[PDB]
Design a protein around this ligand. Sequence first.
Ligand SMILES: O=P(O)(O)OC[C@@H](O)[C@@H](O)[C@H](O)[C@@H](O)CO
Ligand SMILES: O=P(O)(O)OC[C@@H](O)[C@@H](O)[C@H](O)[C@@H](O)CO
Ligand SMILES: [Zn+2]
Ligand SMILES: [Zn+2]
Ligand SMILES: [Zn+2]
Lengths: 188, 188
Amino acid sequence: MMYKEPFGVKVDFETGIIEGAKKSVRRLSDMEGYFVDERAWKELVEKEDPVVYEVYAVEQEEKEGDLNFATTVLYPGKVGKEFFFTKGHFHAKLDRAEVYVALKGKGGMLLQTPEGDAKWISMEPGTVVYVPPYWAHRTVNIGDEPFIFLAIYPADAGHDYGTIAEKGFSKIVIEENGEVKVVDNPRW
Amino acid sequence: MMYKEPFGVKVDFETGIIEGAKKSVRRLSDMEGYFVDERAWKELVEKEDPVVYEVYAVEQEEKEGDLNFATTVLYPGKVGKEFFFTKGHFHAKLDRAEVYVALKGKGGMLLQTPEGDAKWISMEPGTVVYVPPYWAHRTVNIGDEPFIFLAIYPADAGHDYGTIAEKGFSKIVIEENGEVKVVDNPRW
Ligand SMILES: O=P(O)(O)OC[C@@H](O)[C@@H](O)[C@H](O)[C@@H](O)CO
Ligand SMILES: O=P(O)(O)OC[C@@H](O)[C@@H](O)[C@H](O)[C@@H](O)CO
Ligand SMILES: [Zn+2]
Ligand SMILES: [Zn+2]
Ligand SMILES: [Zn+2]
């Protein structure tokens, strides 16, 4: 039998960078129809088009039982009152769970079942989050610096962004009067 | 249908402690027939029987697609010339991979195929080790302080200790003349 090579790689807990990883970049312009305030989205995209997040992914072939891992650097920012977040997805194989290891910054995760019932888990350095089977998941940076975490996921989990792209989450995370609020999404 | 509850838990990267996790403890007496120097083992068990390592495990039902995670605190020490290590295991479902995230200390992982061919990976804080399908794996603390890491594995991976308990690994990690050597196992 042919065996894959074991390997070690350095992850910098300060920057989220993994040498030799597939680097992915999500600009604000790539997230049309994601934020509640459309005119604020339009305004910030034309003024700056900030990078919302970067992903450093170490991925195997899509084989059951095997594991991928990836860091996300989610940048600090707001669209209107709404904090920067990742697009959010269900796994293509829905029952595939996931483990997040928060490394730096302050954020949290919004999770949601196919039926639209949502949950908010705060994340700070050292917070390990268990994303159970079937839960869509989006990370949010509620802070002033990059929110950096490591995600470990089944290599055959895949990524389904379609349903979230159109409907979003049932809850949104906003700053009102200087305070972080998880409130119902008006657009849901 | 019923959905499992998402949750976050604090992991102290300094201590390896996971609040509310299942705690397992391995002392030297729990490791009979593991170390090369049979008489050194006996002496230490009778005098002290020190804790070799501790595991904090957050586990789900044994279900495909799900994930478990566990920290290990591998204490520093030697049996004869041979560094403290974990028992080592194959996964019961052999094709199940694993990811380790080194958190504190200095150490490494010994891996071995069903054939007996070996690989050594050095681990220091920040090192992420990819443990491929079919590789047995054992961690070793080659330093003076606790070696702490987080492991993330398929919830249906299982733990096969049998083969390793009787024959060990093909290589041993030892200190000869103040230097750390990965040499052939004579009792193999
Ligand atoms: O894939 P996104 O929603 O744009 O959030 C982006 C990434 O953090 C995300 O891929 C993360 O690595 C895992 O959840 C993958 O299963
Ligand atoms: O299972 P052990 O050899 O007694 O070393 C003990 C632990 O480090 C070990 O359970 C680790 O969590 C993972 O490899 C489990 O798949
Ligand atoms: Zn995911
Ligand atoms: Zn800050
Ligand atoms: Zn294992």
